Amino acid sequence: GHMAEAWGPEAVAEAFRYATRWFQVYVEELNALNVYPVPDGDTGTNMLHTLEAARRELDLADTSRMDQVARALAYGSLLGARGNSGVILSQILRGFAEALKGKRALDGSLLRRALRMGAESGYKAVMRPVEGTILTVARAAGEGARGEALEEVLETALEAAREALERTPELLPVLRQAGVVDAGGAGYVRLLEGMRGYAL
Numbered sequence: 001g002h003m004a005e006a007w008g009p010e011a012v013a014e015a016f017r018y019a020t021r022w023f024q025v026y027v028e029e030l031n032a033l034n035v036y037p038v039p040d041g042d043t044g045t046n047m048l049h050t051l052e053a054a055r056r057e058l059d060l061a062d063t064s065r066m067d068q069v070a071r072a073l074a075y076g077s078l079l080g081a082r083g084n085s086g087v088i089l090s091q092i093l094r095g096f097a098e099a100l101k102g103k104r105a106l107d108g109s110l111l112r113r114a115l116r117m118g119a120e121s122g123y124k125a126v127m128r129p130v131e132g133t134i135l136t137v138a139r140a141a142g143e144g145a146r147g148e149a150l151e152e153v154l155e156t157a158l159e160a161a162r163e164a165l166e167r168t169p170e171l172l173p174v175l176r177q178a179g180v181v182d183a184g185g186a187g188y189v190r191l192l193e194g195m196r197g198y199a200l
């Protein structure tokens with residue numbers, strides 16, 4: 001039977017495929033926001049290449065098993081990771097995959113755990129983390145994910161992420177001086193937005 005408020009392994013794979021297709025519209029905007037640590041206009045391109053490599057790996061895997069979906073997500077994202085945002089994103093996805101290992105379906109409760117473990121894995125991966133960044137936005141999303149149904153969890157996680165994103169120039173002066181929010185954190189918002197679109 002269908003679980004209504006839970007994704008099977010095939011649906012989890014489709015969610016990330018959907019989110020990848022969603023992401024491409026926002027690439028040019030993310031590039032133009034990129035001021036930290038250097039303004040070289042590539043955050044959107046870097047994050048998209050990371051996502052696209054995860055999708056290529058999922059297409060080669062047996063997405064009927066949750067442990068194979070998790071393996072493809074971590075392994076693909078690492079190889080395709082580009083730049084600081086891509087490396088961090090790949091390690092966020094590795095923590096997300098870790099929460100999926102040993103589980104048969106992704107429900108609201110596991111999605112909270114996955115978002116929280118993703119943020120911690122991304123934080124541990126950076127040698128010297130800085131706040132006002134993708135790390136701050138990813139952590140807020142996991143902390144603010146509430147509810148039992150997927151849709152409520154994604155909605156509350158997204159709202160907490162958008163709220164943290166607006167506060168990034170308050171924490172990082174280079175963002176305030178340039179009048180932008182963090183490009184990496186904005187990319188993570190767009191990724192959560194795509195996931196909500198799949199679940200809606």
Ligand SMILES: Nc1ncnc2c1ncn2[C@@H]1O[C@H](COP(=O)(O)OP(=O)(O)O)[C@@H](O)[C@H]1O
Pocket residue numbers: 034036037038040042043046047082083084085086088126128129130131132133134135182183184185
């Ligand atoms: N030390 C750090 N701590 C937290 N986040 C970081 C750090 N360094 C970079 N980032 C994230 O990476 C984003 C920049 O991504 P990107 O442009 O791909 O990096 P690069 O400088 O390699 O081009 C920033 O907006 C920030 O969110």
Ligand SMILES: [Mg+2]
Pocket residue numbers: 034036037038039040041042043083
């Ligand atoms: Mg850059």
Ligand SMILES: [Mg+2]
Pocket residue numbers: 040042083
């Ligand atoms: Mg660069």
